[PDB]
Amino acid sequence: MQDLKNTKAPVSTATLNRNEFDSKTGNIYEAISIASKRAVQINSDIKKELLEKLEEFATYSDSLEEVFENKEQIEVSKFYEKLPKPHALAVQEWLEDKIYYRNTEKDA
Amino acid sequence: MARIKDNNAPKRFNKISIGLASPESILAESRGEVLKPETINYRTHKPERDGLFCERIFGPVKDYECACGKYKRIRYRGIVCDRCGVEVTEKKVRRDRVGHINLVVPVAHIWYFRSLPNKIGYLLGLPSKKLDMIIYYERYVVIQPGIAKGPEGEEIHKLDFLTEEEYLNILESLPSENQYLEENDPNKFIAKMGAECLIDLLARIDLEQLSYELRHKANTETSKQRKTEALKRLQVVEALRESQDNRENNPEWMIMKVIPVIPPELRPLVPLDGGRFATSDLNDLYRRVIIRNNRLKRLMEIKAPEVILRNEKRMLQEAVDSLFDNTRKASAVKTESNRPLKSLSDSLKGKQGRFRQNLLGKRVDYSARSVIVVGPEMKLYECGLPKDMAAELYKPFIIRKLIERGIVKTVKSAKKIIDKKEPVVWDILENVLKGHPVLLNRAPTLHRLGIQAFQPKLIEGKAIRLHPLACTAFNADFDGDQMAVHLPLGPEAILEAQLLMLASQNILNPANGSPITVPSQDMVLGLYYMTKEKRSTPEEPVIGEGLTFYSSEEVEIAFNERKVALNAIIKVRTKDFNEAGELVNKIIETTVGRVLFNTVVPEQAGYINTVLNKKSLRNIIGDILAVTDVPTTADFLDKIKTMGYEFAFKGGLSFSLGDIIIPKEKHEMIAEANEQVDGIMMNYNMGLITFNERYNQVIDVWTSTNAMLTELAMKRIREDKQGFNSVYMMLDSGARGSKEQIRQLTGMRGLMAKPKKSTAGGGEIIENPILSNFKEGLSILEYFISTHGARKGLADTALKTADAGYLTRRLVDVSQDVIINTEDCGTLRGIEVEALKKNEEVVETLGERILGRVSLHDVYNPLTEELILKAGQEISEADVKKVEAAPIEKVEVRSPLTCEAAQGICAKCYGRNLATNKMVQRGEAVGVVAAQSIGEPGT
Amino acid sequence: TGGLPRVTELFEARNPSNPITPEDILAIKGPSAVQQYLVNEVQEVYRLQGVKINDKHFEVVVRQMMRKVQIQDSGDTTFLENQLVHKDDFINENDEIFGKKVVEDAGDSERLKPGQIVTARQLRDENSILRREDKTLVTARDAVAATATPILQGITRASLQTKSFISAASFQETTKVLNEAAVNGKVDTLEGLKENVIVGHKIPAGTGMRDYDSIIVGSKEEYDEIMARKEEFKF
Amino acid sequence: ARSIGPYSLITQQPLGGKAQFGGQRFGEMEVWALEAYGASATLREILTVKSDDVIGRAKTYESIVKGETMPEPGLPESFNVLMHELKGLGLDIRLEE
Ligand SMILES: [Mg+2]
Ligand SMILES: [Zn+2]
């Protein structure tokens, strides 16, 4: 699993160098497609980890109130919220050559 | 309620196939048969059983409720009621279920005997008129002569046309046993009439043999007209034959025994206020068809006389023809208001058809719109977003974060919290906005820069904050303009926006590759003011002139200490390119403001030591992007924007009546022009010159006076305050204003054109120009004169914007299919490009024209034999300089016109992508970019 | 005020009200010369107003403006006199009919009728069979290829004759295009932008090319671990 | 500003106008801009799951709320209407993979 605590991906939108992004494939569109597929995978993994963590801190309350207050759950959710977005993590992985891609049609 | 997972998986497809519809196919797709022409009961507003809106065929009107109300709620899903026959399901099914109409007699589709060319006529070889006589039930035609012979003994041939009397006579002359023969018996005499005859005749066609005979006839016939007709029939038969390998395409399917009925929701019966109903024409046409078919069936059952039966069959054919395409009929069925009814065919063509109305444009969710204000403190990739707009747009993301935080367990409670605008909502929205850009669009979107991606920031108020540098791309000012906000949702869309549509990435103009995020107005004026030099005078000594500095650090120290002026001429030691192109330290005479400007300039660009205007700024940004990457250029743009704004604010540059210096000699030269005009007039009165000559001389004198006055006014304003006059600084920098406008504010508005309606010649020029200017004030007469030109200009713009848009639309339509699909097609053909010269003046240099192209062959220097250009390589700026240094006048480069690609254009023939100053990459929609680039300036 | 009408006239291949017409240049100097003339004229009109647009855009447009040829002799091909066809279709038809034989007189042959285009191998086999049967031999003539001359269209006419039937129906003459497609059984492969916009699929440009749907991605560390495990299991 | 709201009768598109709480119109020229950028996914998402993909829009909203992967776009309702008209006019149209 990725070390989300020590990730170098930018938190917000940043001006990325297009030449570095498409250097490996020679086509910015192919790189964008690969990055988005990896971003979908990263988002799935992050959702699974967050769901497990929330289930660990989930408290069973039988009250019929519409608003609940769980400070530990709120803190965990805030920590996950402050992390970079999945697509930013995918871009950071792509820049660091941490994404493996293969074209099935070209290798057939 | 969570939407039910409709297990009808979205049919994945990459191919669309069309063909003739078999009756069996229509029966297979149909859910039932429509007997009654009634639509609904006028009292209970419920659909009539077996009608055009019946619930047994098309589906229940109410969700999970049958027609009779026996079964209700979702618990009876999939159950068809035994009492009313209506399936218990969703109302949405009333959009997909199709009905059918079982016709008593077959009928031909208008599309295949009225369209040019007619398919049935070319298949059967019959002319259109004869086919019409067949279809509308006029004459019988012999399908099979058999043993029947003419009254005089003449041989009867196939396709022969017989009148009713002739048909009866031939039947009487034949033995009764002939009628009892099977249709496959060659001796049987078969002669029918109408669409039944048409299907019987089409089913007997050997398409292969028909193509054989048509080809042989075309090859052997000596008549040109007959050869052309044979080839034209051959065309239809070969097309229909080529249809067969793809799919079952049988010619007799052109005559339908069954007519399908489209789902009712596509032809709605909408009740209006007051008990009135709004109905589509399609309901009326279908109702007419059922009425006529039922009348034919009844007349068949009662065995009506043959003339009446043929008339009713012809009227059924007319009803079917009208329902398919009414408009082609001369006697089209019309309403009481004489408006022709809209048929099924009319739903497709025209500006209001499906294709151009509901498929090419749409309204979208997750969208917003407000007024735009200037956020000059923002970065190039950031936009300010009002709190309400962000809360509504990002509502489901905020809901997700609320459920994740455990505050609310349901989406309803999350919506309640969001609507109350609690601080936790803002705390979550601040994180949600990060990394999720929005798309800003201003109509009209003339080029692709009309939609750009920005990183949103929460702000106060109800106006969207826009970065000033995006205004030129958006053509947006802050006089009341509005922009639409579009929110991408998926990760692919977000990455697409960030990596292609981000404002920081869109520095270049795709039309030419020049920078489009150039500073303007306040920024340019401030940069010009800071970078301009001031020399010392005894009245106004300049602090710090002549000092030498070890680097920009000491210059900054002195400026902050107020020991040197901003415009002082100083000497500093810093990096600059030498004659060899290397980075060395040298003492260069400069200005403190120029040093401060160079403190933010990227190092690799050298030292910039010129007074900054818009043109020089554009060239500087282009060079900086040439030597560095896009992010560095964006940071440079942000820094110079802030610097220009700050140094324009600090100077307090204003507009006063004292800056508009009307020359004191204005009256004297107006008087001299008046004496010259008087000389011309007295010359005319003595007959020395003609009327046209006097008019031309007077115009020449007045225009010479205007030119001299413009030059004198410009000189006065320029030399005022050593070039630091605010109006002169505004004009010279290119921030705002032109020479003509300053002339009108200071000199004389000059000659004006008459509004006369002369059909032959253009507008004549009034011999008396507008002597007064806007500082002196125009008289009543002069103002009335100028109103003509003002109104003319406004009308011209308002009327020609649409023509420019239409040209853009046509270009996009003609160029949409050009996409870079292959890297190299390997052509040896190219275009020979030379420097563009007009009237002995080089308008475009050879290097500028060949910049970004791919070389055809290798090019060698004729003087030094050095390899300047390699075949198959892009022409970069360094190669441009090398070519300009060498005595080369013509360069052969690969061009789209000479490309040999199978689909679209290859990458090498296109050359450089002007939006990135890099080689074009596979997938670029170069055709749309070309169309937009041509169309935008016209608007 | 006159620049926009001039541009519209140039792009439409319209003869001037006082006729050099592009058709004359195409007839005399050739296709490349007329393409260069059109590009230069349009770019000059745009330049007079102080607007800089690269020549490559006009070149791309003019390429689409010259995608058709006019046939001067049908030969034995499927096409018709004075018909406007795609250059690719003309070349494909000429290549398909090349080297074949058209039956002039069928003689006593039962498998061949007069008027069919047959390959030389088939004709030789049929004549050999007839010779074994001692019957009259089939006489066939060489296939005659069609000839055509390049023509220059306006933007409207060029757009009006697209290959896909969905796009053509969307543009104009919906009835005729739909009729011809339904009779011909035409299959639309969705190769343009207008078609995919209409149907709501990914456009075949930029990110949405068909090659990119076949790409399989994954974590490089995970792939290396999987490969190492596979190698360990192979031992 | 609108995330979701009422939809029209025939086209099933989101309504227009501020009084009806509707979305903005995204027409031909702006689609040309998207095509020029090569923004395939943005154009697909806008043409289907934001305008007239009835199942797609609901599934997309549910996925955004629950944080799941975005469902694949379906057939727009405008294309369904076009296909139904062409079928009612007697032309056999099939979707082939
Ligand atoms: Mg405005
Ligand atoms: Zn090429």
Tab-separated table of C-alpha atoms in Angstrom, chain A residues 10-66:
chain	number	residue	atom	x	y	z
A	10	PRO	CA	0.542	18.438	-4.665
A	11	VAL	CA	-2.534	19.026	-2.529
A	12	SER	CA	-4.157	21.492	-4.958
A	13	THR	CA	-4.015	22.009	-8.713
A	14	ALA	CA	-0.534	22.912	-9.953
A	15	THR	CA	1.059	23.867	-13.257
A	16	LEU	CA	2.664	20.601	-14.360
A	17	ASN	CA	5.309	20.304	-17.069
A	18	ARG	CA	3.611	18.693	-20.066
A	19	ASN	CA	6.945	17.627	-21.574
A	20	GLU	CA	7.834	15.521	-18.528
A	21	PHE	CA	4.327	14.042	-18.305
A	22	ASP	CA	4.289	12.746	-21.897
A	23	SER	CA	8.012	11.960	-22.224
A	24	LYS	CA	7.583	8.247	-21.476
A	25	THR	CA	4.743	7.601	-23.947
A	26	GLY	CA	5.270	10.421	-26.445
A	27	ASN	CA	1.540	11.194	-26.345
A	28	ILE	CA	-0.089	13.320	-23.651
A	29	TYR	CA	-3.495	11.710	-24.237
A	30	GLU	CA	-2.210	8.174	-23.640
A	31	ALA	CA	-0.436	9.348	-20.486
A	32	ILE	CA	-3.640	11.025	-19.288
A	33	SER	CA	-5.637	7.839	-19.899
A	34	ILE	CA	-3.086	5.709	-18.026
A	35	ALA	CA	-3.008	8.223	-15.171
A	36	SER	CA	-6.803	8.235	-14.914
A	37	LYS	CA	-7.012	4.437	-14.825
A	38	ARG	CA	-4.367	4.386	-12.090
A	39	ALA	CA	-6.341	7.148	-10.352
A	40	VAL	CA	-9.462	4.976	-10.377
A	41	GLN	CA	-7.447	2.138	-8.831
A	42	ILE	CA	-5.972	4.503	-6.219
A	43	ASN	CA	-9.418	5.887	-5.382
A	44	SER	CA	-10.763	2.363	-4.895
A	45	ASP	CA	-7.872	1.477	-2.574
A	46	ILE	CA	-8.248	4.730	-0.616
A	47	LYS	CA	-11.990	4.201	-0.217
A	48	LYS	CA	-11.391	0.664	1.051
A	49	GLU	CA	-8.786	1.843	3.574
A	50	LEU	CA	-10.993	4.706	4.777
A	51	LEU	CA	-13.991	2.382	5.108
A	52	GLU	CA	-11.946	-0.064	7.186
A	53	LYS	CA	-10.658	2.739	9.421
A	54	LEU	CA	-14.154	4.184	9.898
A	55	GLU	CA	-15.568	0.742	10.713
A	56	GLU	CA	-12.828	0.437	13.334
A	57	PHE	CA	-13.913	3.752	14.903
A	58	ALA	CA	-17.651	3.335	14.233
A	59	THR	CA	-19.767	3.652	17.383
A	60	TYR	CA	-23.205	2.026	17.539
A	61	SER	CA	-25.700	4.679	18.672
A	62	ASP	CA	-29.410	3.859	18.940
A	63	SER	CA	-30.467	7.514	19.217
A	64	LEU	CA	-32.918	8.775	16.592
A	65	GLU	CA	-31.054	12.091	16.285
A	66	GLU	CA	-30.307	13.299	12.764
